[PDB]
Scaffold this active site. Structure first.
Site, mmCIF file in Angstrom:
data_model
loop_
_atom_site.group_PDB
_atom_site.id
_atom_site.type_symbol
_atom_site.label_atom_id
_atom_site.label_comp_id
_atom_site.label_asym_id
_atom_site.label_seq_id
_atom_site.Cartn_x
_atom_site.Cartn_y
_atom_site.Cartn_z
ATOM 1 N N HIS A 1 0.683 -1.253 0.110
ATOM 2 C CA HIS A 1 0.013 0.107 0.038
ATOM 3 C C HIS A 1 0.843 1.241 0.001
ATOM 4 N N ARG B 1 12.460 -5.413 14.773
ATOM 5 C CA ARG B 1 12.897 -4.053 14.072
ATOM 6 C C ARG B 1 11.679 -2.881 14.494
#
Lengths: 219, 219
Positions: free
Chosen positions: A148, A210
């Site tokens: 997206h 992360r």
């Protein structure tokens, strides 16, 4: 004025002592990158990669985010969005609850805006960012986001950890440019448009966790 | 209903008989381009050049613009704009004065939108356009405009006359891409972003009159 009820009170001292805060938290090569001495990298079209943050500021922000604890996000609906329906869910802590939204906005208007103006000739920046949050991706909590774009004229992606040592996996994937940013830099960040000519996709992470800070600027 | 109060009443018959308007106004090879079997050209990165309208439609539009006579524009300030100041002055007539803005919007929603969706994956188009005017480029009247951008997600430019035979000069020059449109086509149209990643400057016409169509899509 100094709020002593903070783990790292020097983080909010940007308004009181801009010179010391800039000299301590900003990357040493930020001035060199802005002056036009290389540093900036463009592995993909209409993309840039220059040093923005330093190790101390990133570590302090990560520690503050860990101290916040409430790693909200992960549901399709959104409680901080006016519409109430978030297109893409991710486990992230908003800057509004942490109170760093104003400081981050001031820092972006001071340093990030001149960098954007220099990179793109004839572009005027007012540094109006309505959304700014740091998302933590884990192998069992939040996988890679679906393909997206970003609801902003330009989208900035900033890493918060050293690659490899902290997390194992990948970053993003530009399907339009057929390029992947497989070597994120802890001290550097990327500021590229994501409105019409960028269909961003998230790569997965195998081992480790992360954390990436992305602020939707100019929406 | 067939109003004869026009030089070309068929120009307003886009919605009355959509099949007839598509057969007598649109480009013959435009359907093949929408099929995705060539025709569409990308002389520069993130740029498209495919035929959109037929010669008859271009001739009708040029005749209507010439008969309108309301060729305003040429001052930094303006009365059509709500702000009252025009960033780049140009001698152009808005579609609102002519009254064919509804027809242009219908054509953009019918043919332009599907092409934009097919060309750029992952993006949704709604044919939202506001700023759209026809400007005649004359070396004696309207010289080349300075390099600038467009305050829209996408920009579309369509030629309205045959270059060389009617006008002498150049097209556009990409400052950040080193791309110059030296052989524009009357039927072909230029579709590319113009917000952040591209800074463009128009080449100067020398002889005759160059007629171009400008439309700010997704502002």
């Amino acid at each position: 004025r100094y709020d002593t009820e903070h783990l790292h009170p020097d983080l909010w001292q940007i308004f009181d002592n801009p010179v010391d805060w800039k000299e301590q938290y900003i990357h040493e090569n930020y001035s060199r990158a802005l002056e036009g001495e290389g540093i900036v990298e463009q592995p993909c079209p209409d993309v840039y990669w220059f040093p923005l943050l330093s190790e101390q500021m990133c570590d302090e922000l990560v520690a503050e985010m860990e101290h916040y604890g409430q790693w909200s996000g992960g549901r399709h609906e959104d409680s901080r969005l006016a519409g109430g329906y978030e297109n893409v869910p991710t486990v992230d802590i908003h800057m509004k609850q942490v109170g760093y939204e104003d400081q981050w906005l001031q820092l972006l208007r001071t340093y990030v805006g001149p960098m954007t103006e220099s990179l793109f000739p004839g572009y005027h920046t007012k540094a109006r960012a309505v959304m700014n949050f740091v998302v933590r991706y884990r192998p069992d909590e939040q996988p890679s986001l679906r393909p997206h774009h970003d609801s902003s004229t330009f989208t900035l992606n900033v890493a918060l950890n050293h690659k490899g040592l902290d997390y194992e996996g990948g970053g993003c994937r530009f399907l339009r440019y057929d390029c992947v940013i497989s070597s994120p830099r802890k001290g550097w960040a990327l500021l590229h448009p994501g409105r019409l000519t960028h269909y961003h996709e998230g790569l997965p992470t195998t081992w480790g966790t992360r954390y990436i800070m992305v602020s939707f600027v100019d929406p």
